[PDB]
Amino acid sequence: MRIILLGAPGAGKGTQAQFIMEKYGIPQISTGDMLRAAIKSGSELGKQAKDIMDAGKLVTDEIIIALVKERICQEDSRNGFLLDGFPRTIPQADAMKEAGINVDYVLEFDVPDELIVDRIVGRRVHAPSGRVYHVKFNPPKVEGKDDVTGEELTTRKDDQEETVRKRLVEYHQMTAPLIGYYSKEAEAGNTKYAKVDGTKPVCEVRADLEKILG
Numbered sequence: 001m002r003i004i005l006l007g008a009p010g011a012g013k014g015t016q017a018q019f020i021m022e023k024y025g026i027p028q029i030s031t032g033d034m035l036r037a038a039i040k041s042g043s044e045l046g047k048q049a050k051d052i053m054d055a056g057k058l059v060t061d062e063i064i065i066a067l068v069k070e071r072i073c074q075e076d077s078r079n080g081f082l083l084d085g086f087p088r089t090i091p092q093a094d095a096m097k098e099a100g101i102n103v104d105y106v107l108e109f110d111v112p113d114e115l116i117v118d119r120i121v122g123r124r125v126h127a128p129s130g131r132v133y134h135v136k137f138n139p140p141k142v143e144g145k146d147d148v149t150g151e152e153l154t155t156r157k158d159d160q161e162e163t164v165r166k167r168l169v170e171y172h173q174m175t176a177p178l179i180g181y182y183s184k185e186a187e188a189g190n191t192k193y194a195k196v197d198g199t200k201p202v203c204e205v206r207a208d209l210e211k212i213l214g
């Protein structure tokens, strides 16, 4: 089963990627998690990426496509995979299309800009695992601490409100057209599309996607 998650930064894609991984047993390919992993390893990728991400900009299509190609051409990607953060631009999409890769489901998380900025102030991560929490809407069971390890949570560096606002501008210019892109793909029979209300609580969003995938 091959799935793509679309939606503005903060819409809760990664939050629901976790659940979809652990309930249908397909790997999460997160471009954001891979970039943040590269910084932590201190690789060449990590060094090129850090400044771009800090500035709330998109990393070049070439680097991203190479990165995602590598991680697909690993093992256990025969049963399926879940893309989260990719594609992010039309060229990223067309590259996948031209390489002959089709997806079964394209899932869109609609959430307006207002909420997005209010959300991200409450976002907390367990940096080793990439587990994501919201202090109000999806809180850790112990304030400030990862549920699994008890390790202190941090805020992401690119989560200051200036940087967030840039990510949304980029999203509306570069990424939003992908909605049209995959609607049309769905219309031609090449995939299934579905929208959801991501403003809903995290259990109600979980529910709609059970209701959608089966």
Ligand SMILES: Nc1ncnc2c1ncn2[C@@H]1O[C@H](COP(=O)(O)OP(=O)(O)OP(=O)(O)OP(=O)(O)OP(=O)(O)OC[C@H]2O[C@@H](n3cnc4c(N)ncnc43)[C@H](O)[C@@H]2O)[C@@H](O)[C@H]1O
Pocket: 007, 008, 009, 010, 011, 012, 013, 014, 015, 016, 031, 032, 033, 035, 052, 053, 054, 056, 057, 058, 059, 060, 064, 084, 085, 086, 087, 088, 119, 120, 122, 123, 124, 132, 133, 134, 135, 137, 138, 167, 198, 199, 200, 201, 202, 203, 205
């Ligand atoms: N493909 C690419 N091409 C070029 N560059 C790339 C790239 N991919 C990555 N990059 C680079 O690096 C950065 C992008 O970062 P990236 O890692 O791709 O995104 P996030 O930063 O992972 O943003 P999503 O945009 O992934 O947010 P989310 O939808 O997953 O929702 P989340 O569950 O976290 O939720 C938000 C907060 O949501 C709270 N919350 C979740 N659900 C609910 C709910 N249902 N109700 C209320 N609150 C909720 C969450 O718990 C948490 O508090 C890129 O911008 C660029 O810098």
